[PDB]
Amino acid sequence: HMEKVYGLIGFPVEHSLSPLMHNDAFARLGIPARYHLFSVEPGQVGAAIAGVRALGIAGVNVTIPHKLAVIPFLDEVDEHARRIGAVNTIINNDGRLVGYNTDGLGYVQALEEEMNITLDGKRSDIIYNQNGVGMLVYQGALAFEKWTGQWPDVNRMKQLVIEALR
Amino acid sequence: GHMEKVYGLIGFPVEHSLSPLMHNDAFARLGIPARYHLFSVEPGQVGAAIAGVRALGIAGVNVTIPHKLAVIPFLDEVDEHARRIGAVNTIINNDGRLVGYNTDGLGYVQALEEEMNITLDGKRILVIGAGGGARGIYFSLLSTAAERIDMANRTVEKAERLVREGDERRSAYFSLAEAETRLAEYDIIINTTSVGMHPRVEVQPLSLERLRPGVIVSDIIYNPLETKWLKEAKARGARVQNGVGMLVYQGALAFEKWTGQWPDVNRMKQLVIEALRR
Ligand SMILES: [Cl-]
Numbered sequence: 001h002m003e004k005v006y007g008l009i010g011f012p013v014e015h016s017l018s019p020l021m022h023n024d025a026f027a028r029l030g031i032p033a034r035y036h037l038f039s040v041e042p043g044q045v046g047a048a049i050a051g052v053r054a055l056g057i058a059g060v061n062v063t064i065p066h067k068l069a070v071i072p073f074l075d076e077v078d079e080h081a082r083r084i085g086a087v088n089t090i091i092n093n094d095g096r097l098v099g100y101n102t103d104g105l106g107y108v109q110a111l112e113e114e115m116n117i118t119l120d121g122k123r124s125d126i127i128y129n130q131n132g133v134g135m136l137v138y139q140g141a142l143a144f145e146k147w148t149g150q151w152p153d154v155n156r157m158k159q160l161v162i163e164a165l166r
Numbered sequence: 167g168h169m170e171k172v173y174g175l176i177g178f179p180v181e182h183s184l185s186p187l188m189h190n191d192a193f194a195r196l197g198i199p200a201r202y203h204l205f206s207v208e209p210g211q212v213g214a215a216i217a218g219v220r221a222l223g224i225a226g227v228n229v230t231i232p233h234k235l236a237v238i239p240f241l242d243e244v245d246e247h248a249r250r251i252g253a254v255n256t257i258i259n260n261d262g263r264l265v266g267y268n269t270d271g272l273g274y275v276q277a278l279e280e281e282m283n284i285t286l287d288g289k290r291i292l293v294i295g296a297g298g299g300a301r302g303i304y305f306s307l308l309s310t311a312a313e314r315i316d317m318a319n320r321t322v323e324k325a326e327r328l329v330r331e332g333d334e335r336r337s338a339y340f341s342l343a344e345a346e347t348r349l350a351e352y353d354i355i356i357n358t359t360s361v362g363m364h365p366r367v368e369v370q371p372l373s374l375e376r377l378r379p380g381v382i383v384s385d386i387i388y389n390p391l392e393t394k395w396l397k398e399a400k401a402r403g404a405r406v407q408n409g410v411g412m413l414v415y416q417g418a419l420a421f422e423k424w425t426g427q428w429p430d431v432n433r434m435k436q437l438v439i440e441a442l443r444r
Pocket residue numbers: 324327
């Protein structure tokens with residue numbers, strides 16, 4: 001079968017662990033696809049996004065330093081991402097590119113699940129190299145769910161991440 | 167873990183390709199951090215796709231119908247052999263600079279010499295058809311020590327035009343009718359037309375009536391794995407070859423151009439044949 005293409009856009013991206021967790025998750029769920037790393041120099045972000053649409057790449061995550069840069073090139077941006085003024089997740093719907101930001105929701109969810117608490121109280125270090133691991137995994141999983149419609153096994157993603165960071 | 171490099175095919179359509187099958191298996195057997203994908207590119211979306219290749223850092227892509235001519239303006243450089251053919255089927259991305267090549271000719275030739283264990287020295291060759299699928303083969307054959315490379319085509323003027331681009335000292339142009347009458351004058355006969363290809367199988371590129379026994383009859387068609395033409399040639403005592411080899415060597419040459427390593431062609435043929443017989 002023809003696998004769909006996904007990946008991470010950023011500069012640098014070579015040491016990202018997103019491929020590790022996403023690819024294991026695709027396989028686990030029998031999803032014909034692969035997650036890659038796209039090193040995009042500042043100045044070519046416009047061409048990278050136009051490139052995503054033209055090549056039919058299914059979707060891409062966006063890390064430093066393009067979260068803000070990709071916005072003018074999308075066809076639609078989620079009100080939340082607009083407000084934040086940053087996008088870390090893009091999906092290509094038959095040519096229409098929509099931007100989302102799962103960094104926040106991801107931090108929150110990973111917090112209350114890893115700490116087993118509820119923010120309704122006063123209402124951790126995101127650096128993973130509480131860890132930022134939970135955040136890395138959850139923001140990715142939210143993106144994974146947007147693309148595939150399936151919520152991946154986060155415990156497995158965390159396990160692979162941690163093991164690698166060690 | 168290492169960053170996988172991205173390769174793929176651009177065209178419209180691309181889903182039928184066997185390149186992923188071949189390349190992904192080769193990357194695995196050789197321990198190469200990479201994957202070959204399929205990228206559908208609509209006519210008029212070529213400039214954006216190429217710009218994408220540069221921006222995203224895609225290592226290389228093959229090009230097929232109907233973009234082999236259309237991609238040229240977006241390339242920084244085009245190999246001399248590809249410029250002569252006027253089509254690019256292989257692009258390598260050298261850290262931002264795109265160079266195009268065409269593996270048609272060498273793919274065919276190298277597969278012929280190896281599969282049939284022969285040298286082209288002094289061979290009298292007849293190429294049938296004068297289309298894009300024949301230009302690479304024709305030009306590469308001219309670079310060998312073949313005795314002659316003649317060309318036959320239904321519309322003789324197209325063959326004449328191509329021969330003028332060639333030598334004219336070792337190559338003459340003929341109509342299919344003329345070619346059939348002098349079919350005995352050739353050591354190797356090559357069909358580059360799609361006559362006999364799926365689904366219109368019960369027809370042949372040209373009559374083998376005057377074919378000599380023991381000569382080589384080469385058909386680049388690989389679907390079916392044996393055209394009516396090849397079957398009859400075998401019956402007439404000819405050594406035969408379908409296009410599987412060309413397809414494979416086209417892939418191997420691009421693969422080597424990209425990685426610097428020559429893949430296992432027998433393994434590639436094995437997978438290809440299985441996919442075709444499926
Ligand atoms: Cl012409």
